[PDB]
Design a protein around this ligand. Structure first.
Ligand SMILES: O=P(O)(O)OC[C@H]1O[C@@H](n2ccnc2)[C@H](O)[C@@H]1O
Ligand SMILES: O=P(O)(O)OC[C@H]1O[C@@H](n2ccnc2)[C@H](O)[C@@H]1O
Lengths: 519, 523
């Protein structure tokens, strides 16, 4: 509590300052960016950089993790008139005022539902502003890139955001119970986003949360297992300005003392409700691990490597019945749409080795995920699809084409891929290669990999390394795609290099203090 | 005294988890071709895994290292045996290395001497069999084979034979950098149809540099370049070459420039010429030479974001603008070939006009130079000199294939040798990563050798630890390319380590990684 209050890193990002752009449709919005001014003699405008760090890097805002972040999104949600306060919330150190919400009976609360109704929500304008990086349409816009048939506009408008969401091609993860959130969008026609994984002291985890988003993590997932992951997660969500994801089966397994066999729908249901009221923005759910797909993995070089996938497979095998997450998929949807939680359909059968890439198991699950996508959309629930994994370079394009076709252009969310298995200790690098390429091919979010992958638990230095690696991978992809806003950054830093403006070069880099130190 | 400094600092002995093994030549029965081998747990019932090993005798317990004497000159006797070279009457003489045991050689007038000349003459040399054996990683030659990859129209065989190697050299599509005066060399091949090689740069105390050489090759550097500037550069380089089992490259203009006291305008042919001969006799295996930076090309760089970033290129640009004359490396190219051919030194045609930023990638100057390199290539071949081509640079991902396409066409499939490329400019201090991305991709598209990049790129001088990070980063990039190309030897390594991860054989997982000590420590 107090041990965290000091250990966490706050203050402006070295070389820059927090700036805000206000909304027009919703005049009270303040959309955050960070700004990097260069030498006056350079005679250039400051450079605007996308910033997921939150109020933590704004000295005007008092931080107190014991109280949580300001709930600056709560008012915009209540004002829509479709949510009511939950009379008696579910209940499980404890986090020390916050009302808990749920859609009114018969009301529609998801971003997808709103978008299909023709409605531009506050979150949507928020995202449109955020995605433009304060660029003005004052100069001609010439595209240099190859985006493989994507529809990235010269300039994002709130109406474009609504169009993308309504068609299922973008999502805004935004539980009505995460009032702290600074809205972001995931989708091919926007900037490539990245995810940081946290989870095994409360301070340590909040710390990694703040550290991860300080350096550019766009979402964070709390992958905690073991004792007291509910209370733990309170501390993270209340103090997070980025979307927070989870794998609900992890906690459900704990309730049944780590026995996959003893898992059931009731425990999983209770867990969902608990996490919905908590403010979790997306759930990874391995509903595509079907009974008959499991024997397809017996011949694999590395079997089933997914944690969530292994758990479901163990249940299916012990009972010899169809995956109950797959079975109750409609009932899962009826819960999530009441709070606007997004689906992240998991790859239980992802390749754990390049030998296993693009095999029958992986693709069978993938095509099943596409089917479930349409069922999710019918209930008005937003979706993204999870991908591999270990994939040699010549198979990465093929991964992307299978997803695009079989999953109806829903956003893709990958773990790497790692492009070779032979370099433990450097897996952030083997995966950065695969991550940059697949993002180029159209992947919307990249889950990070740290050097400790396959070996140990990431400390806050491994977290940073991972985040910086994936930020540069994501940006390399934006640039190759010809994203309208990518090359101003590269050109700014390159003009500084040219003129020997060493300080501007450091301040414009993903990691200014490391660059200055090495110089 | 320097010798104590050196012998104490350098890392020697078995590479953790593996042991030096040799395969004997058959065409040349005295050849001993090195690999390293990693045995896995007996309960796995698997043969040891054979790994390509450029570490040299430093990790061979059968050999007693002694830097004062240099490395075993195991190559001298095969060179001499051909009867095409003779001792130099009066060798050029420039902490000095005790170079008393080494005869210096030069081609006899009218004799064949270069690997390219022998190859075109239908001759299979000791270096050719050596590399063919090496490239096979001790795999079984009489075996059905089916390849899973996409090599974009390469000509990779299921199994490398000495004649395949000869054929590749003769058409100019592969080289073997091997100066007759580098008797310590363990021969290696560079070519699209062989394993992707990597290069580590060192240079700026002698013991500092010899350590980096040993450290670099220990972790998998296939060649090394001594990019030293300033004073003592000839004498330092003695300590490197005599103690290198890998090919050593330089950029001769760096030294030529020092002889004329930093003034690029005072360079001239006489000083360049004398530099070439000195390094030829020293045993330098390849010369990066920026002969494509032509006078009319220089104003094209004016419209660039970062202009001319090549050090060698900038030096030549300065000379040209000052004397208002065509690049003399270009004008006297013929004479340069006649010198190199007499010692079998390979050309590395430098990219003086490479893009220093993604913005300038694939522009007029870059490609104008590339087509010129392509024309110099034919002239070099006419003189019987081996050639590889140097390339970018900073290039965003979507422009990378186009680079390979232009190179293959205009430079007639000669081997390509890239520095990265870096695929974005905004991560100083992580440029080994931004460039690993480009390097793996262009390796996949057919690039033969990848010049590495460390976290210090653009910022500082790499220390011991930066050199290793760069080397490991490029080894995995080069391997990622081999795997994606469907190279017949690549999958075995990845599969072995994946079986170890699956069966929870931690020791084996550690030992089969590019960096065993790190993995064990992280675990
Ligand atoms: O599938 P398992 O349970 O192994 O791993 C879940 C974690 O891996 C991430 N992921 C992303 C794509 N595939 C998997 C997912 O977002 C979460 O961070
Ligand atoms: O062009 P300059 O003189 O800056 O750099 C030459 C170094 O950079 C390497 N290189 C490789 C491809 N392009 C450049 C070349 O092999 C040598 O190692």
């Amino acid at each position: 509590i107090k041990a965290v209050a000091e250990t966490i890193s706050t203050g402006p990002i070295p070389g820059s300052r927090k700036v805000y752009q206000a909304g027009e449709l919703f005049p009270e919005l303040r959309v955050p960016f960070r700004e990097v001014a260069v030498h006056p003699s350079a005679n250039e405008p400051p450079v605007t950089i996308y910033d997921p760090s939150g109020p933590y890097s704004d000295p005007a805002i008092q931080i107190d993790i014991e109280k949580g972040l300001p709930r600056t999104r709560e008012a915009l949600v209540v004002a829509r008139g479709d949510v009511e306060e939950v009379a008696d919330p579910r209940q499980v150190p404890e986090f020390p005022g916050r009302k808990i919400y749920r859609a009114k009976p018969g009301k529609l609360v998801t971003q997808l539902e709103y978008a299909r109704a023709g409605i531009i929500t506050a979150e949507m304008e928020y995202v449109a502003i955020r995605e433009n990086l304060r660029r003005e349409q004052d100069r001609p816009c010439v595209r240099d890139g190859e985006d493989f048939g994507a529809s990235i506009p010269d300039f994002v408008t709130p109406e474009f955001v609504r169009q993308e969401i309504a068609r299922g091609r973008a999502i805004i993860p935004a539980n009505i119970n995460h009032g702290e959130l600074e809205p972001m969008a995931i989708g091919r026609n926007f900037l490539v986003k990245i995810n940081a994984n946290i989870g095994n002291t409360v301070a340590d985890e909040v710390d990694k949360l703040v550290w991860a988003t300080r350096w550019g993590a766009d979402t964070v997932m709390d992958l905690s297992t073991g004792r007291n992951i509910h209370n733990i997660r309170d501390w993270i969500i209340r103090n997070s300005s980025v979307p927070i994801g989870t794998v609900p089966i992890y906690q459900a397994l704990e309730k049944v003392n780590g026995v996959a066999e003893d898992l059931n729908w009731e425990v999983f249901r209770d867990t969902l409700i608990e996490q919905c009221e908590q403010g979790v923005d997306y759930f990874t759910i391995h509903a595509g691990v079907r009974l008959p797909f499991i024997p397809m993995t017996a011949k694999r070089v590395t079997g089933i490597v997914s944690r969530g996938g292994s758990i479901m497979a163990k249940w299916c095998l012990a009972h010899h019945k169809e995956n109950f997450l797959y079975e109750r998929f409609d009932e899962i949807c009826e819960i999530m749409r009441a709070y606007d939680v997004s689906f992240s359909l998991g790859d239980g059968l992802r390749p754990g080795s390049t030998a296993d890439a693009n095999d029958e198991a992986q693709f069978s699950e993938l095509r099943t995920l596409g089917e479930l996508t349409k069922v999710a959309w019918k209930h008005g629930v937003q979706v993204m699809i999870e991908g591999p994994g270990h994939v040699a370079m010549h198979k990465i394009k093929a991964n992307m084409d299978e997803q695009l076709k079989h999953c109806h252009e829903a956003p893709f969310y990958t773990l790497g891929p790692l492009t070779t298995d032979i370099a433990p200790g450097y897996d952030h690098i083997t995966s950065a290669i695969g991550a940059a390429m697949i993002g180029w091919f159209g992947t919307a979010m990249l889950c990070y990999v740290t050097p400790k992958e396959h070996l140990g638990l990431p400390d806050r230095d491994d977290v940073k390394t991972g985040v910086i690696t994936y930020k540069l991978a994501a940006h390399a992809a934006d640039l190759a795609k010809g994203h309208p806003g990518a090359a101003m950054w590269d050109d700014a830093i390159s003009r500084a290099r040219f003129e020997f403006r060493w300080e501007d070069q450091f301040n414009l880099g993903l990691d200014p203090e490391t660059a200055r130190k090495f110089h």
